[PDB]
Amino acid sequence: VAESWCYTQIKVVKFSYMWTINNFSFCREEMGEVIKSSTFSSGANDKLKWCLRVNPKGLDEESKDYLSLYLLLVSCPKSEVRAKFKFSILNAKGEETKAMESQRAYRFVQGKDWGFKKFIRRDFLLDEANGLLPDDKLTLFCEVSVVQDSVNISGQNTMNMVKVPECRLADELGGLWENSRFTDCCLCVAGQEFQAHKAILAARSPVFSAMFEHEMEESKKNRVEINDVEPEVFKEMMCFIYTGKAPNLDKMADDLLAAADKYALERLKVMCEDALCSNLSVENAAEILILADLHSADQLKTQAVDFINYHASDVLETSGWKSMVVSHPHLVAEAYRSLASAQC
Amino acid sequence: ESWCYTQIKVVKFSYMWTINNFSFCREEMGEVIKSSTFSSGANDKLKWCLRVNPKGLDEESKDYLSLYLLLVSCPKSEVRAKFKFSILNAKGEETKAMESQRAYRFVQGKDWGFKKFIRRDFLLDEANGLLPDDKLTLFCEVSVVQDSVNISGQNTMNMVKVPECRLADELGGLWENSRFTDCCLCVAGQEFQAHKAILAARSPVFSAMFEHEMEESKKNRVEINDVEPEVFKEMMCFIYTGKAPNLDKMADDLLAAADKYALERLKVMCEDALCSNLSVENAAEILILADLHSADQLKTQAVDFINYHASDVLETSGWKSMVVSHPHLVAEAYRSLASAQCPFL
């Protein structure tokens, strides 16, 4: 309807970073002495690289009590990148208070530097009443808004007289479980019967498939001894194997995660990690560390280490952490190495 | 999320210096009191010192006492330093002492400092309380700072990220290894292997006769002749890999196979591929194929194309061939035209 479908959508890659200028009150690398930062990227593939250039005393003498900051593009593929940036003045609580943003999105090319002359006054930063230098530490928050804005669409306005269902590989196999049809062999776990067959299980499971052919199916095809999981978790992985999804996640993520680690099912591991990553807590941190370590969830190890870094004030005395300490010296050694060396 | 950090290392150390009986020292010297060396902070890396001039080295310093600081030893020529000095607050005096405003480069063996301090008699004046037991206490703070930084930081994190979904890898991976050879189907000479449950699920027609309680005999001597082996391989690739890159040039045979196997999905993709294949010279053949295969969507598209391009479609002899061979098609086309064109004589 309406012939054309002009739906021009603007793609804005928004991402922000924060500074840490140690003891700015007496750095005094002024009047042309260049200072750089850590190069940073948006994360969406490696094309864009920025480096800051701060002048405590700005170039030219007109910015005597004023400072000017310039963002420089070190190198990028030639695409005439257009982007927008903003900065702010920060408080002790780490929230932007006096936020100033660039009026327009500035066109960038390789090696070009864009910034505002006399960006901000020196004395207001140095004002004691404003409290912008807690422990003489200066923080500066920047929010980049790189925009591509390169999209052209033509056509088509197909009325779609016939509705085409998508691929039916999952639901057709998903609906066969309750019917329990075409099950050649038996399958019992923890004394409860779950009628399934080894063909599709072998097809959708390399571990069992390797285990299937090697000197069991000749004799013990009908009965296979499974005890690592209770039926409530085995049915969940069964549903995941056939349907391709495990909707009952949050209530039973942990034991599902352990079962996935036993069978080396990476997708189950990461999605259970997603379920449990949001559930990080002071009281539950220790058992999360132990479960991640036993399951070799390195990413969950890192996130839990970060949680301990941010909550060392209270997590350390928790009885779970003490149990981890007495039981798992290696975990606490790793935590000490991370929080000591990387942080300092 | 960067964690810029940007450490700027500074080592603030100090060196108290106290001269016993300062009144008597003014006479038995004219130039310098070379003090002892000192170090602290970073593992005693740097040796520093100082020397006062109770009597001025030069005429300018004859008016004002000079405490002109010196460097003893250092590894690097470039050493930026801020040095502040005062009295050791015996009474209440945290003022009256100056500062070094600008960071100066301290090279090996060189001396640097200030010299305009105080009048000599005023310093010796007891009213100012600068002679505790005839001693001169100093609170000499030195702050060395370094070529900037040690940048980074990074703070690269966005949740945890997940691997690619693994529906197709399991099917494709098993086929490549050629493991679990459940059956050997010999069709057109070439031998093809496959499994039971997946073929039954994807193809209901294959599931039809294998549901009749006979499977072992048929698999050993399966009869497949309506479809060429190449289209069978294309079917295998579409089922397992999930793509049919060369479907465009084999739509007719693949569409016929889908009709035989009652594959609505494959038939739909075949019709869609054939939709963007109509030309001005072979429209009759496409319409005949659509009618034979009961392609309702393709048949309707062909009818619309003919209605639009009848000025040239009827010119070709294919229309006359259809008229002679298929009178019922002409009859129903005329019925549709008359019903659609109610007005006009």
XYZ file of C-alpha atoms in Angstrom:
689
model
C 0.000 0.000 0.000
C 1.076 3.605 -0.662
C 3.377 2.343 -3.450
C 6.832 3.183 -2.082
C 8.184 2.331 1.384
C 10.591 5.205 2.009
C 11.660 4.345 5.573
C 15.062 6.012 5.899
C 16.453 4.893 9.265
C 19.549 6.464 10.833
C 22.112 4.052 12.304
C 23.738 5.669 15.356
C 26.462 3.656 17.104
C 26.310 5.051 20.650
C 29.088 4.205 23.103
C 30.693 6.075 25.997
C 33.962 6.095 27.933
C 35.318 7.612 31.144
C 38.651 9.200 32.052
C 40.962 8.967 35.052
C 43.533 11.775 35.272
C 45.656 10.957 38.311
C 46.367 13.988 40.556
C 45.543 16.589 37.909
C 46.158 19.428 40.390
C 49.949 19.247 39.842
C 50.510 17.391 36.564
C 51.593 20.608 34.816
C 52.421 19.262 31.352
C 51.368 22.583 29.875
C 51.670 24.601 26.653
C 52.005 22.042 23.893
C 53.188 18.975 25.807
C 50.997 16.323 24.190
C 49.265 13.749 26.395
C 47.573 10.666 24.938
C 45.045 8.139 26.239
C 44.211 4.478 25.762
C 42.907 3.931 22.241
C 39.295 2.750 22.227
C 36.813 1.403 19.687
C 33.057 0.910 19.523
C 33.430 -2.885 19.568
C 31.480 -3.440 16.348
C 34.508 -4.614 14.330
C 37.870 -2.787 14.120
C 37.696 0.229 11.800
C 37.624 3.275 14.103
C 40.437 4.339 16.448
C 40.527 7.497 18.581
C 43.176 9.039 20.813
C 42.724 12.057 23.058
C 44.975 15.128 23.180
C 44.566 17.199 26.358
C 46.304 20.562 26.803
C 46.383 21.686 30.476
C 47.426 25.057 29.046
C 45.750 25.362 25.672
C 47.550 26.132 22.441
C 47.720 29.895 21.836
C 47.538 32.390 24.705
C 43.866 33.331 24.254
C 42.933 30.202 26.248
C 44.765 31.444 29.328
C 42.119 30.523 31.919
C 40.385 28.321 29.313
C 41.156 24.805 28.088
C 40.603 23.142 24.711
C 40.233 19.399 24.101
C 40.698 17.729 20.706
C 39.735 14.225 19.578
C 42.051 12.809 16.902
C 41.431 9.981 14.424
C 44.657 7.982 14.211
C 43.638 5.811 11.252
C 40.559 4.215 9.697
C 39.447 2.802 6.337
C 38.530 5.563 3.905
C 34.770 5.967 4.346
C 34.284 9.652 5.333
C 33.114 8.758 8.829
C 30.571 11.144 10.358
C 30.291 11.167 14.143
C 29.092 13.242 17.089
C 30.670 13.562 20.534
C 29.924 15.114 23.911
C 31.694 15.665 27.225
C 30.702 16.697 30.736
C 31.909 17.859 34.145
C 31.697 15.104 36.751
C 30.931 15.032 40.477
C 32.022 12.837 43.376
C 29.112 10.450 42.717
C 30.183 9.814 39.109
C 27.164 11.335 37.343
C 27.351 14.050 34.698
C 26.298 17.448 36.068
C 27.334 20.117 33.517
C 27.083 18.183 30.254
C 28.095 19.969 27.043
C 27.492 18.372 23.642
C 28.722 19.227 20.164
C 26.118 21.200 18.232
C 26.629 19.236 14.985
C 27.887 15.810 13.956
C 31.397 16.485 12.667
C 32.691 14.866 9.491
C 35.869 12.885 10.201
C 38.674 11.742 7.914
C 41.945 9.992 8.705
C 44.390 12.103 10.696
C 41.852 14.880 11.341
C 41.340 16.490 14.755
C 38.069 18.106 15.852
C 37.506 20.047 19.054
C 36.310 23.299 20.565
C 38.785 26.081 21.221
C 38.514 27.343 24.820
C 36.432 24.276 25.636
C 36.043 24.911 29.379
C 37.241 27.411 31.969
C 40.120 26.442 34.247
C 39.041 28.255 37.419
C 35.599 26.623 37.613
C 37.348 23.253 37.519
C 39.751 24.629 40.145
C 36.900 26.087 42.229
C 36.943 24.453 45.654
C 33.225 24.914 46.344
C 32.207 23.054 43.176
C 33.993 19.933 44.426
C 34.963 18.656 40.970
C 38.348 17.241 42.116
C 37.715 14.568 44.768
C 41.120 13.556 46.147
C 42.542 15.842 43.420
C 41.299 13.280 40.856
C 39.672 14.474 37.623
C 37.109 12.357 35.770
C 35.785 13.186 32.298
C 32.906 11.307 30.656
C 32.541 11.180 26.870
C 29.693 9.674 24.833
C 30.432 8.996 21.163
C 27.537 8.897 18.685
C 29.127 7.645 15.455
C 26.531 7.578 12.663
C 26.802 5.669 9.388
C 23.731 7.023 7.547
C 24.452 4.974 4.402
C 21.326 3.024 3.437
C 19.205 3.105 0.268
C 16.242 0.778 -0.317
C 14.221 0.336 -3.519
C 11.022 -1.648 -3.972
C 9.054 -3.805 -3.689
C 5.519 -3.775 -2.224
C 4.810 -7.474 -2.672
C 1.257 -8.017 -1.441
C 2.138 -11.579 -0.300
C -1.050 -13.278 -1.467
C 0.277 -16.577 -0.040
C 1.757 -16.850 3.457
C 4.944 -18.945 3.523
C 5.713 -20.643 6.873
C 9.342 -20.582 7.963
C 11.570 -23.633 8.375
C 9.731 -26.376 10.282
C 12.739 -28.397 11.447
C 12.275 -27.585 15.141
C 8.532 -27.571 15.852
C 7.849 -30.707 13.791
C 10.506 -32.492 15.842
C 9.327 -30.599 18.923
C 5.765 -31.892 18.698
C 6.870 -35.520 18.320
C 7.998 -35.798 21.960
C 4.549 -35.805 23.571
C 3.334 -38.165 20.847
C 6.377 -40.376 21.587
C 6.241 -41.852 18.076
C 9.031 -43.609 16.164
C 10.928 -44.493 19.363
C 12.838 -47.681 18.555
C 14.562 -48.147 21.940
C 13.900 -47.328 25.593
C 15.540 -44.660 27.741
C 15.192 -44.523 31.540
C 16.799 -42.030 33.933
C 16.618 -42.125 37.749
C 13.933 -44.812 37.617
C 11.558 -42.726 35.454
C 10.802 -43.696 31.859
C 11.313 -41.218 29.005
C 10.561 -42.928 25.697
C 13.078 -41.651 23.136
C 15.416 -43.088 20.490
C 19.161 -42.861 19.964
C 19.118 -41.862 16.273
C 18.241 -38.170 16.570
C 20.120 -37.987 19.881
C 23.272 -39.212 18.128
C 22.620 -36.796 15.262
C 22.294 -33.836 17.663
C 25.000 -34.883 20.154
C 28.611 -35.698 19.133
C 29.530 -36.837 22.661
C 26.815 -39.494 22.862
C 27.305 -40.344 19.178
C 30.944 -41.179 19.872
C 29.796 -43.000 23.009
C 26.950 -44.731 21.147
C 28.991 -46.648 18.575
C 31.739 -47.744 20.997
C 30.740 -51.096 22.483
C 27.386 -50.226 24.115
C 24.747 -50.308 21.366
C 25.684 -53.919 20.598
C 24.459 -54.940 24.079
C 23.154 -51.985 26.139
C 21.250 -50.029 23.475
C 17.895 -50.612 25.180
C 19.011 -49.400 28.632
C 21.602 -46.678 29.294
C 22.505 -45.744 32.871
C 22.161 -41.985 33.474
C 22.443 -40.660 37.037
C 24.322 -37.335 36.837
C 21.031 -35.398 36.586
C 17.568 -35.695 38.061
C 14.652 -36.181 35.622
C 13.681 -32.500 35.847
C 16.990 -31.536 34.197
C 17.187 -34.463 31.760
C 13.770 -33.568 30.359
C 14.975 -29.979 29.954
C 18.033 -30.981 27.917
C 15.822 -33.393 25.962
C 13.516 -30.487 25.095
C 16.528 -28.368 24.144
C 17.945 -31.126 21.925
C 14.695 -31.654 20.027
C 13.045 -28.208 20.035
C 16.327 -26.260 20.100
C 15.416 -24.102 23.119
C 15.195 -24.351 26.917
C 12.504 -21.863 28.015
C 12.502 -23.109 31.637
C 15.854 -21.453 32.333
C 15.894 -19.204 35.401
C 14.284 -21.629 37.860
C 16.839 -24.380 37.111
C 19.777 -22.671 35.398
C 22.495 -23.886 37.783
C 21.980 -27.650 37.523
C 21.238 -27.209 33.820
C 24.578 -25.399 33.555
C 26.349 -28.269 35.318
C 24.693 -30.839 33.051
C 25.660 -28.810 29.978
C 29.248 -28.637 31.223
C 29.227 -32.421 31.624
C 28.186 -32.862 27.970
C 30.230 -29.865 26.707
C 27.137 -28.122 25.293
C 28.494 -24.611 24.809
C 25.197 -22.883 23.988
C 23.520 -24.172 27.153
C 26.554 -23.075 29.174
C 26.537 -19.507 27.872
C 22.759 -19.053 28.125
C 22.745 -20.370 31.699
C 25.608 -17.945 32.348
C 23.394 -15.161 30.983
C 20.631 -16.291 33.336
C 23.017 -16.341 36.311
C 25.082 -13.263 35.382
C 22.161 -10.975 36.232
C 21.724 -12.894 39.517
C 25.140 -12.024 40.990
C 24.806 -11.134 44.667
C 27.000 -10.651 47.721
C 25.592 -13.667 49.561
C 25.656 -15.961 46.503
C 29.035 -14.917 45.061
C 31.134 -17.722 46.559
C 29.113 -20.669 45.259
C 28.953 -18.909 41.888
C 32.762 -18.797 41.845
C 33.031 -22.484 42.752
C 30.437 -23.554 40.168
C 32.122 -21.474 37.459
C 35.549 -22.892 38.316
C 34.392 -26.518 38.333
C 32.545 -25.960 35.033
C 35.481 -23.991 33.528
C 33.222 -20.996 32.805
C 36.076 -18.534 32.351
C 33.784 -15.651 31.389
C 31.627 -16.160 34.481
C 34.899 -16.338 36.412
C 35.835 -12.882 35.122
C 32.417 -11.343 35.796
C 32.279 -12.787 39.315
C 35.817 -11.508 39.912
C 34.619 -8.053 38.861
C 31.658 -8.369 41.235
C 34.050 -9.228 44.071
C 36.196 -6.256 43.054
C 33.188 -3.941 43.344
C 31.871 -5.562 46.570
C 35.030 -6.506 48.498
C 33.743 -4.451 51.445
C 31.188 -7.107 52.471
C 31.638 -10.246 50.352
C 34.924 -11.225 52.022
C 33.470 -11.918 55.476
C 30.589 -13.977 54.043
C 30.629 -17.550 55.336
C 30.397 -18.838 51.773
C 33.584 -16.983 50.885
C 35.320 -18.403 53.964
C 34.231 -21.905 52.937
C 35.640 -21.195 49.476
C 38.872 -19.955 51.074
C 39.408 -23.059 53.194
C 38.226 -25.419 50.437
C 39.554 -23.721 47.262
C 42.959 -22.040 47.687
C 43.429 -21.811 43.912
C 40.266 -19.742 43.440
C 41.308 -17.209 46.075
C 44.805 -17.103 44.582
C 43.284 -16.292 41.188
C 41.087 -13.627 42.786
C 44.120 -12.066 44.471
C 46.113 -12.132 41.228
C 43.271 -10.464 39.326
C 42.442 -7.807 41.927
C 46.114 -7.042 42.686
C 47.993 -7.070 39.369
C 45.349 -6.091 36.803
C 43.752 -3.444 39.022
C 47.181 -2.165 40.122
C 33.621 1.786 29.540
C 37.372 2.450 29.222
C 39.008 2.539 32.677
C 41.524 5.051 31.373
C 43.514 4.938 34.639
C 46.472 6.862 33.109
C 48.784 6.577 36.098
C 51.200 9.499 36.475
C 53.820 8.282 38.925
C 55.051 10.809 41.502
C 57.447 10.098 44.382
C 57.106 12.720 47.122
C 60.008 12.580 49.585
C 61.468 15.034 52.074
C 64.735 15.756 53.874
C 64.888 17.533 57.224
C 68.087 19.500 57.794
C 68.966 20.996 61.177
C 72.142 22.966 61.910
C 73.239 23.127 65.546
C 74.142 26.582 66.883
C 73.291 28.537 63.743
C 74.548 31.783 65.304
C 78.155 30.550 65.374
C 78.051 29.063 61.863
C 77.570 32.463 60.187
C 81.230 33.380 60.740
C 83.197 30.220 59.852
C 82.005 29.945 56.239
C 81.486 32.185 53.229
C 80.153 29.957 50.444
C 78.380 26.677 51.245
C 77.388 23.997 53.735
C 77.387 20.844 51.589
C 74.942 18.638 53.478
C 74.758 14.855 53.429
C 72.985 12.881 50.717
C 69.598 11.223 51.140
C 67.137 8.939 49.376
C 63.713 7.430 50.017
C 60.545 6.334 48.259
C 61.284 4.196 45.207
C 63.813 1.735 46.706
C 66.409 4.489 47.284
C 66.906 4.817 43.528
C 67.758 8.539 43.539
C 70.237 10.414 45.741
C 69.418 14.061 46.516
C 70.848 16.750 48.802
C 70.962 20.506 49.396
C 73.295 23.257 50.538
C 72.603 26.579 52.246
C 74.605 29.796 51.805
C 74.738 31.643 55.158
C 76.872 34.232 53.352
C 75.935 34.854 49.754
C 77.817 33.263 46.886
C 77.227 36.400 44.778
C 76.349 40.025 45.479
C 72.649 39.376 44.857
C 72.620 36.706 47.579
C 74.494 38.898 50.084
C 71.167 40.531 50.971
C 69.094 37.331 51.208
C 69.946 33.845 52.443
C 69.970 31.098 49.797
C 69.016 27.424 50.192
C 69.980 26.265 46.712
C 69.137 22.610 46.113
C 71.299 20.012 44.361
C 71.021 16.550 42.812
C 73.618 13.958 43.834
C 72.976 10.958 41.569
C 70.340 9.941 39.029
C 70.045 7.362 36.197
C 68.200 9.569 33.696
C 69.140 13.072 32.590
C 65.497 14.188 32.399
C 63.979 14.487 35.889
C 61.023 16.820 36.460
C 60.771 17.958 40.086
C 58.633 20.198 42.282
C 60.343 21.109 45.568
C 58.728 22.932 48.496
C 60.502 23.701 51.761
C 59.629 25.370 55.065
C 60.276 25.119 58.828
C 59.459 22.064 60.978
C 56.561 23.813 62.800
C 58.111 24.008 66.279
C 55.840 26.919 67.127
C 52.927 27.682 64.806
C 54.494 28.406 61.410
C 53.120 26.703 58.298
C 53.627 29.952 56.309
C 56.563 32.320 55.546
C 58.088 29.657 53.221
C 57.961 29.715 49.430
C 57.221 27.109 46.734
C 58.766 25.988 43.449
C 56.061 26.887 40.937
C 57.518 25.288 37.790
C 58.698 21.721 37.238
C 62.360 21.900 36.203
C 64.545 19.258 34.583
C 67.194 17.986 37.015
C 70.206 16.653 35.109
C 73.020 14.662 36.705
C 75.236 16.725 38.996
C 73.409 20.018 38.390
C 71.999 22.312 41.075
C 68.780 24.316 40.993
C 66.725 26.319 43.457
C 65.765 29.772 44.676
C 67.764 32.365 46.621
C 65.526 35.316 47.702
C 64.315 34.133 51.115
C 64.563 36.577 54.017
C 66.854 39.250 55.405
C 69.713 37.791 57.428
C 69.050 39.869 60.548
C 65.310 39.203 60.271
C 66.008 35.467 60.120
C 68.304 35.861 63.133
C 65.596 37.950 64.829
C 64.177 36.118 67.838
C 60.814 37.890 67.489
C 60.013 35.674 64.496
C 60.892 32.605 66.582
C 63.191 31.194 63.888
C 65.999 30.234 66.326
C 64.759 27.327 68.467
C 67.809 26.648 70.654
C 69.910 28.483 68.039
C 69.037 25.880 65.386
C 67.521 26.195 61.905
C 65.010 23.422 61.238
C 63.959 22.765 57.641
C 60.912 20.918 56.276
C 62.148 20.343 52.727
C 59.581 18.516 50.588
C 60.574 17.311 47.113
C 58.160 15.910 44.518
C 59.539 14.193 41.402
C 57.226 13.535 38.449
C 57.762 11.505 35.353
C 57.325 11.440 31.556
C 53.568 10.957 31.309
C 51.694 7.696 31.706
C 51.385 4.138 31.045
C 47.988 4.570 29.276
C 45.265 1.806 29.500
C 42.807 0.443 30.712
C 40.460 -0.977 27.918
C 37.253 -2.142 29.798
C 35.977 -4.070 26.685
C 32.792 -5.963 27.770
C 29.228 -6.337 26.502
C 27.345 -8.946 28.566
C 29.237 -12.196 27.713
C 28.525 -12.941 23.997
C 27.337 -16.376 22.801
C 28.457 -18.789 20.040
C 26.566 -19.131 16.787
C 23.409 -21.230 16.894
C 24.171 -24.882 16.208
C 21.145 -26.339 14.395
C 22.894 -26.830 11.045
C 26.412 -27.768 12.189
C 25.243 -31.022 13.787
C 23.532 -32.204 10.598
C 26.347 -31.061 8.316
C 29.124 -32.391 10.531
C 27.707 -35.911 10.758
C 27.243 -36.184 6.986
C 30.846 -35.221 6.203
C 32.359 -37.878 8.480
C 30.204 -40.568 6.795
C 29.630 -42.331 10.129
C 26.629 -44.393 11.252
C 25.955 -45.882 7.814
C 22.486 -47.197 8.635
C 21.639 -48.086 5.020
C 23.061 -48.145 1.492
C 20.648 -46.910 -1.187
C 21.712 -47.738 -4.756
C 19.911 -45.433 -7.209
C 21.131 -44.822 -10.777
C 24.351 -46.682 -9.964
C 25.590 -44.187 -7.388
C 25.291 -45.223 -3.738
C 23.751 -42.820 -1.208
C 23.619 -43.100 2.586
C 21.135 -41.460 4.947
C 19.231 -41.960 8.207
C 15.680 -43.049 8.973
C 14.059 -40.574 11.373
C 15.206 -37.395 9.612
C 14.122 -38.648 6.179
C 10.766 -39.780 7.572
C 10.169 -36.430 9.287
C 11.220 -34.170 6.409
C 9.556 -36.292 3.693
C 6.075 -37.617 4.625
C 5.969 -39.694 1.429
C 9.141 -41.523 2.473
C 7.519 -42.028 5.879
C 4.426 -43.448 4.143
C 5.536 -46.911 3.017
C 8.092 -47.318 5.817
C 5.123 -46.967 8.205
C 3.697 -50.218 6.753
C 5.877 -52.365 9.091
C 8.355 -53.127 6.259
C 11.643 -51.192 6.272
C 14.586 -53.593 5.952
C 13.594 -55.072 2.584
C 12.696 -51.761 0.929
C 15.917 -50.030 2.007
C 18.078 -52.764 0.473
C 16.108 -52.533 -2.814
C 14.584 -49.048 -2.730
C 12.979 -48.080 -6.053
C 13.642 -44.440 -6.999
C 13.249 -43.559 -10.694
C 10.946 -40.519 -10.977
C 13.799 -38.272 -9.750
C 17.313 -38.145 -11.175
C 20.220 -38.831 -8.777
C 21.476 -35.245 -9.116
C 18.170 -33.857 -7.840
C 18.363 -36.432 -5.034
C 21.778 -35.040 -4.084
C 20.306 -31.531 -4.193
C 17.526 -32.731 -1.875
C 20.133 -34.174 0.498
C 22.074 -30.898 0.483
C 18.940 -28.820 1.082
C 17.801 -31.046 3.952
C 21.160 -31.209 5.738
C 23.107 -28.053 4.852
C 19.930 -25.969 4.533
C 20.699 -24.184 1.240
C 20.049 -24.800 -2.467
C 22.451 -22.455 -4.299
C 21.858 -24.052 -7.734
C 18.062 -24.240 -7.413
C 17.489 -21.678 -10.182
C 18.612 -23.919 -13.064
C 16.819 -27.049 -11.747
C 13.480 -25.636 -10.589
C 11.300 -27.793 -12.854
C 12.671 -31.193 -11.806
C 12.952 -30.101 -8.169
C 9.397 -28.733 -8.246
C 8.125 -31.998 -9.741
C 9.944 -33.951 -7.023
C 8.399 -31.697 -4.370
C 4.978 -32.379 -5.891
C 5.671 -36.120 -5.737
C 6.902 -35.833 -2.134
C 4.129 -33.366 -1.137
C 6.762 -30.830 -0.031
C 4.836 -27.576 0.306
C 7.921 -25.642 1.437
C 10.213 -26.836 -1.361
C 7.401 -26.273 -3.859
C 7.010 -22.709 -2.560
C 10.707 -21.911 -2.999
C 10.684 -23.540 -6.443
C 7.702 -21.416 -7.498
C 9.338 -18.279 -6.083
C 12.513 -19.025 -8.043
C 10.412 -19.614 -11.166
C 8.489 -16.374 -10.547
C 11.546 -14.286 -11.507
C 12.194 -16.344 -14.647
C 9.349 -15.425 -17.037
C 10.251 -14.158 -20.517
C 8.304 -13.076 -23.593
C 8.978 -16.181 -25.734
C 8.549 -19.141 -23.328
C 5.617 -17.914 -21.216
C 3.402 -20.666 -22.647
C 5.786 -23.385 -21.451
C 5.898 -21.884 -17.950
C 2.095 -21.681 -17.840
C 1.804 -25.304 -18.991
C 4.293 -26.425 -16.335
C 2.425 -24.480 -13.645
C -0.896 -26.015 -14.698
C 0.564 -29.537 -14.768
C 2.123 -29.169 -11.299
C -0.945 -27.426 -9.779
C 1.104 -24.310 -8.965
C -1.758 -21.991 -8.043
C 0.473 -18.996 -7.279
C 2.610 -19.500 -10.389
C -0.511 -20.107 -12.486
C -2.070 -16.863 -11.237
C 1.153 -14.955 -11.927
C 1.287 -16.401 -15.449
C -2.362 -15.458 -16.017
C -1.674 -11.891 -14.868
C 1.419 -11.685 -17.083
C -0.594 -12.919 -20.073
C -3.378 -10.423 -19.341
C -0.779 -7.644 -19.248
C 1.229 -8.725 -22.326
C -1.436 -10.268 -24.595
C -0.448 -7.713 -27.257
C 2.662 -9.854 -27.921
C 2.062 -13.155 -26.082
C -0.563 -14.328 -28.586
C 1.776 -13.585 -31.515
C 3.888 -16.688 -30.865
C 2.745 -20.056 -32.207
C 2.755 -21.487 -28.675
C -0.662 -19.949 -28.069
C -2.030 -21.686 -31.171
C -0.416 -24.950 -30.055
C -2.130 -24.660 -26.666
C -5.423 -23.791 -28.381
C -5.277 -26.877 -30.601
C -4.003 -29.239 -27.900
C -5.935 -27.832 -24.904
C -9.378 -26.501 -25.897
C -10.507 -26.463 -22.254
C -7.815 -23.911 -21.382
C -9.154 -21.640 -24.130
C -12.716 -22.213 -22.910
C -11.952 -21.298 -19.296
C -9.811 -18.329 -20.380
C -12.714 -17.030 -22.477
C -15.087 -17.604 -19.554
C -12.794 -15.619 -17.248
C -12.426 -12.804 -19.789
C -16.181 -12.561 -20.386
C -16.946 -12.675 -16.658
C -14.286 -10.049 -15.940
C -15.363 -7.874 -18.897
C -19.040 -7.540 -18.046
C -19.422 -4.133 -19.806
C -18.826 -3.469 -23.529
C -20.808 -5.023 -26.387
